[PDB]
Symmetry: D2
Subunit: 451 residues, 4 copies
């Protein structure tokens, strides 16, 4: 329909970069997009291109591909794509992507605000490919190291970012004034579960479970631990994927509970509300996160809850005896022990009540969420630049971490993205404010240059 | 279509009754209905009629008539009427009521499980009228007094129930072996608000607000305190009822939140789950009530939340300046003081944040819920019959309160209904289990007689 | 929960029956149920049992088992079950069935008026089994023959009904004063299609297609002709059932169109509207059937249309080239020729526009509806009893066919059920008015006896 | 948020224009917008401005303001605004309008594709105001007259457009090579109804009914003739607007029927389908319009049908006697005579069945649709330029009417918009394809200039 906008120019890796971004998921992608738009005279009247590079450990752009369950839907309006809430005229809107694919009229006839996760990933992939010249894939960042252009001074004014090539194992280094860490989360596992190849986090569902359970027709016993959106999607999907299997949903809560996207509550995810949340005290922020927990954690989309309920009711129609059901839910349970050294294909899972019985399974899917602390390890050698006494990174409103002013130049800095819920609200790890935040980040990072 | 079933026979008030029920709301009505069905040879094979009387302070049957807001809907499936979950063959089902009115086919074409509150009240009224011979209306019960058929013994074996005729003020007494107290709740007011005729509880909305604000066209300022279903219904309704008024919703929470009727959670209201809840410890029961709070308290029907949100959005369309809106919501506020002695028509309401500004209004609707402690006052003179040391009534699973066995005959007793959430679960004060509980109560109370 | 009501007594087959019913599908079942209720003193105050028998060719009760597609839903509110609109107190209501199965509370939490076809069939099966003593299964009726108790007179006053035992092939005869023919429809095939085992009517989908296509993993090509509810259900289901197959929906219309159950239109299915429809002239009845055609024929449930549309859109997401899609719709087409004598597994289907290209397929499902003329063949030897000149059976309002009064006794007669759309409206072949019609039929047939 | 794009320059009215557009409703507005975008180097790489003027008879931009009923909703996805389907990057998209108003995030939380008609009008108004320099309001075009730059030749190469200033009555003339007529429809009245100020077309509902019925509290009798979307909206609205009135919906059909926007059917409104429709024969086009009639004419939005049905059911709850209802529907009726010369405030409306009774009313709203023939009158003096024998204007695919090539220069022409259903399909008079058609029109009209 139209031509794609001009590509960003790559930078030789031996040159000092203006910005180096760790990760090229949605959060980094939104920053690339906002930078493109900011450098677009059509979009910004005022609009040399900044020297920028993105390091991504995956071999190409992918969005949670381990959980790309068939049928899985976005839990957010497509209007909250990577550009529209910042500038609906952007070439990087979902609607413009659809138009470019010749699909916009057909999507309109769906009357849905919620694309398949598959389609939304391809949207983001389609955006991502327009930045290929400035993204280095298959590069896993392993550390950020402070640098001094004047080694005999006591002022840091750049950082060296070292990454391991995931194919060759070789170590590269790139130097930059500013670093963004946007690396999402790491799998959270209950500390009571032993390491076993049959015990698999939800994040590796689509990738590593079919490797373990190769025959989709075989009568497997498969359990799912958890009662959030991932637990539900996996529990529901196993029933299609392995149709002769016996599945068990194990949860410490009494029920799957619906996610709250009711319109007054949902305004906590508005981009303008980040100022409001950020400015509250630590205590009020903690109470606020708790009060709105049903919008984000340990909750399932009502539609999916209802579909699973109907499936269970259909089992009840066929057999009033719940102990005989092919697919069962076991609420208010916790796993107290996992026998997993026996000769059998199966582990023995021992269960008790979760208030203050055994299953034998071929695999246990563990849908217990994510931690967002992995940036700490990347930043270990830059900790000493923090103000005296700090043992945590303190991100400012504009997401730049606080550093000792007498140790670090004002031209140099490190920003965090996607790990700042404590300071910036429940929207921080989601897609909800990426469009606007990208804009804010470009302004924060490239502000002098673009003025 | 069919004839109504045989009426129950009245009892002369000077005779010793088998059962005397205080209140003829839904809970008592469900007991009348279950008794009728139990005495129906068509419904119960095994089926002299028990001597029974109901005392109701209203002049005729009415169901929360002060909150019969136009458009107001049931928040419960009609299948949970006063008989169906006990016996769908009962003549007292909602569907059979519709058939009797010649309306069943038209209701079917609505495709709704949720009747207007108006229609459901008329259903219950239609049931209630079939018990007119055994209900004494306009009788307000004021005390229950222990009696001894042998005054020189130390055993109580009946109770005298005294009521005040609401029209004549005259005091009547009726004697009975067994008493049921089913009197619902009393208005809960925040203790910080002064008594004023302009400050009116939600329960008296339809009755006493139009008496105060007589001219529906006048530009009143009207506030609503609270963020539950009643606050919402009243806030929304005032906008139709007084179209030129300026309304303000004052709430200490940050948002109206949706009621949870998602299907797995909603099973806590199943009749069979009362056994389960009752048998849990006090501590587990407390934690359970807390965990499922969003099913019952401080929550609004999503549909109503969404309609109010749309109304506010339409105001935003007309004027981006929220300070100028005719109808406004003020979240995270508490009332710190109410000036109400000035010469003006209006009170001055002083507001502060509810985290750890003034309105001038013609009336303040206070939608802050109910207490369920009024039975305590009726039972003051029977307290001494409790086991030594008890300062609260302890209802058994079958809702009969515990009494000292050496002080009270096994043929005599007092049952509580609708005030037992602490011991019987969130369904206790609702319509949810009335059909089944009525059956259980008839069995508990009339069990010997019906065997 | 309760006990089942008393069984009806069987009749020795050599005795003259009061009523003999051909078929024990829903329509006959509704008559059995209404008769039971009419003989129930609990339900009818006024209430020797009539001598009745039902002849059904299937070996046991089954409801369209060839189209019991997984997930398939009722297209009618459960309130229009086989008794409720006549008498909601009946033991044969859907809700009472649920209660008897201990499932009523769980069904309530579905919040649906539309059961799975599987569940509704089991409801009807559960009803049907209560009449086992008076139903002879595996009996295919082949003719109805006039009888004269006085052979030398010219008055017919009974009929002999002869049936072929489907297992033994043996012929039985039973004599009766009154006959009901309630045998539903026969498969309508386009006259241009040749007989071939690979060409299968929708009615035999679940039974005879898996016999033909034994391996569910094989890449079959399967076509579906038609664009009604059956075509849609089969088209959608093949995609799950044979996941590697290539399916093609062939339709002469341009689109699947949604069924109209909007509430004002839907009142044509009200039981009371049959009087209104019946009394209109032939011309007005014809125009009326045409005007409301979108309620009944060549239409699909919006929900199913939307799901199929989403599946096609998902194919579009993966591949913009519709010619490469696994599952395709070909609108405005007609089949002009079917090569089916070649050596290949597959038939060659030749297509042209349907306005005034070839597929090779392993099977063609033909979803082109039903005829309702099979009663004509059963009644061939009784035609001469019609009034002079009639070449069609003329059913009165009460569904008794017109006969020459001087040739047939007033105590003898034949009623038609389910084939009377022309005279009684679009509800005649559906479940919509079975409850009320059953009552009317019992009154019409057994009226003298029950007075 | 961003600045508005550059304004188009006005043209002195004594200059020969490139394009003169009659009407500035949605269709003309979409052409203005597409022209702006085509001249935008940001949107079109290749991008002297054409000399253009729009003549609109209203004093300012308004969209069907006589039917801007409170609550009225768009019946089309906002994605089908005036630019998005052509170019989602356009500054004239609905989403960009929302962003400019600071409302985009709040609209997102509505989760609706269907704005209030009020909001969508303000969207279009907001677009329209950006073309104020080239629109002359209060100008009613009365004729288009052929011109010859060489009067002694036989070739027309311009047209003079004459308009009457609606305030001063003065006549202006403007000359142009090309003319677009985009003037929408004129009120269709049944020819059997007499002229009376109490008989008012739906198009003048919000403007001229409250002038007639000044007191909203008065017990008026008001009838509505028709059963389409307008009849329904007016019938429903009168009940709020005049709460003590008795309203009557008079319709020749038996029921309000729902509009078909089911997704396969709805593809007839796709912009790409205009090529397909246009190329079909006259006969096939006629049959096609008939087949899809339920998408466009004599149909009501299911949601509105359902709301009206619920209102009627609520009347039934209060009173089983339909003859006493405040608001009544009278189906299958036609008006045979209107007494309207009597002394009373009210007309007497005589009714009969519509198959092949009197009301006395204060006003009759006539909701019987529109004609689209008014361009004929404007073009009367240019008819002779058509090819010999034509008595109708024949619009080409690109909407330019056919003219004799030897009588009219190739640089001169007349285009029709919004009146071409017969040749271009059911989307022609709607908003459905305005975005794309605007683009096509700009290309058709300004094609040489923009190359
Ligand atoms: C199954 C699932 C469904 C979800 N659905 C939604 C939804 O519908 N709507 C919504 O708003 N949110 C949703 N989320 C939330 C999700 O967090 C955000 O949508 C989004 O993924 C966050 O973007 P991100 O860039 O911050 O993190 P990520 O998406 O995790 O991307 C971070 C990137 O950094 C790479 N990376 C990590 N470490 C390194 C390293 N050391 N070196 C180099 N590269 C590295 C990773 O490969 C990854 O690509 C969902 C999450 C999950 C798990
Ligand atoms: C606005 C509102 C809407 C509601 N909607 C629902 C719903 O949709 N679904 C649901 O399940 N629940 C609903 N509820 C909950 C409600 O508590 C129950 O539906 C029902 O009213 C409880 O019945 P009850 O008999 O226990 O109490 P009540 O309904 O309050 O009846 C008690 C009766 O006792 C009488 N009484 C009180 N004191 C005396 C006395 N001293 N002497 C004599 N008579 C006395 C009273 O006049 C009253 O009639 C709603 C409550 C409110 C306030
Ligand atoms: C797939 C499908 C789905 C449908 N879904 C609905 C719905 O959701 N709601 C609705 O209202 N309607 C629905 N219908 C319409 C259907 O016609 C009625 O629901 C119902 O089946 C009609 O009952 P019936 O007894 O008249 O005919 P049938 O159901 O066809 O029963 C007639 C019986 O007579 C037996 N029989 C036939 N010939 C003989 C013979 N010579 N001798 C002895 N026995 C014989 C047959 O075995 C059969 O059991 C559906 C139809 C189909 C095909
Ligand atoms: C109540 C109502 C609701 C509708 N809702 C929708 C909807 O939700 N979605 C949809 O797709 N369609 C809808 N429509 C269809 C409607 O036709 C189109 O939306 C749109 O109005 C068509 O634009 P138009 O410019 O062709 O005609 P119009 O909107 O009628 O505009 C034509 C303009 O020309 C002016 N004009 C007329 N004659 C002259 C003259 N001689 N000289 C100068 N100016 C003149 C008129 O003042 C008018 O402004 C609706 C129609 C009505 C009546
Ligand atoms: N899990 C995603 C939550 C997104 C949030 N409801 C929003 O509207 O932004
Ligand atoms: N507020 C009424 C709650 C009723 C409960 N959801 C139930 O289904 O019983
Ligand atoms: N009445 C408006 C019809 C619009 C059409 N359904 C469309 O989607 O374009």
């Amino acid at each position: 329909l139209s031509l794609d906008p001009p590509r960003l120019r790559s930078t030789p890796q031996d040159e000092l970069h203006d910005l180096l971004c760790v990760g090229f998921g949605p959060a980094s992608l939104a920053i690339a997009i906002a930078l493109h738009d900011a450098l677009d005279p059509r979009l910004n009247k005022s609009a040399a291109q900044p020297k920028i590079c993105f390091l991504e450990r995956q071999k190409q752009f992918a969005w949670h591909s381990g959980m790309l369950v068939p049928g899985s839907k976005m839990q957010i309006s497509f209007i909250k794509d990577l550009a529209t809430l910042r500038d609906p005229r952007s070439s990087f809107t979902f609607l413009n992507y659809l138009h470019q694919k010749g699909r916009l009229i057909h999507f309109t006839n769906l009357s849905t605000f919620l694309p398949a996760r598959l389609e939304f990933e391809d949207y983001m992939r389609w955006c991502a490919q327009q930045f290929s010249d400035v993204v280095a894939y298959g590069e896993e960042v392993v550390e950020v190291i402070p640098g001094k252009s004047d080694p005999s001074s006591s002022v840091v004014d750049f950082f060296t970012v070292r990454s391991r090539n995931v194919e060759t194992g070789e170590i590269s280094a790139r130097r930059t004034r500013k670093v963004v860490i946007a690396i999402g989360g790491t799998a959270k596992m209950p500390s009571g579960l032993p390491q076993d190849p049959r015990i698999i986090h939800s994040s590796k569902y689509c990738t590593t479970l079919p490797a373990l359970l190769k025959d989709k027709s075989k009568p497997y016993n498969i359990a799912v631990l958890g009662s959030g959106q991932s637990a539900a999607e996996i529990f529901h999907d196993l029933q299609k994927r392995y149709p002769n299997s016996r599945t068990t949903l194990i949860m410490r809560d009494s029920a799957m509970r619906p996610s709250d996207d009711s319109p007054f509550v949902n305004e906590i995810f508005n981009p303008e509300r980040v100022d409001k949340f950020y400015s509250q005290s630590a205590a009020e922020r903690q109470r606020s996160l708790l009060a709105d927990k049903a919008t984000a954690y340990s909750v399932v989309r009502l539609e999916l809850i209802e579909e699973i309920y109907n499936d269970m009711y259909l089992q009840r129609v066929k057999n009033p005896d719940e102990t005989q059901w092919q697919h069962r839910i076991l609420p208010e349970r916790k796993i107290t022990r996992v026998e997993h050294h026996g000769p059998q294909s199966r582990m023995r899972i021992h269960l008790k009540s979760s208030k203050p019985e055994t299953l034998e399974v071929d695999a246990l899917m563990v849908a217990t969420g994510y931690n967002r602390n992995a940036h700490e390890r990347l930043l270990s050698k830059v900790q000493h630049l923090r103000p005296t006494g700090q043992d945590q990174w303190k991100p400012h409103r504009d997401y730049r971490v606080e550093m000792d002013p007498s140790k670090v130049s004002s031209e140099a800095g490190i920003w965090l993205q996607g790990c700042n819920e404590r300071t910036h609200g429940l929207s921080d790890s989601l897609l909800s404010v990426l469009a606007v935040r990208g804009g804010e980040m470009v302004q924060s990072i490239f502000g002098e240059q673009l003025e």
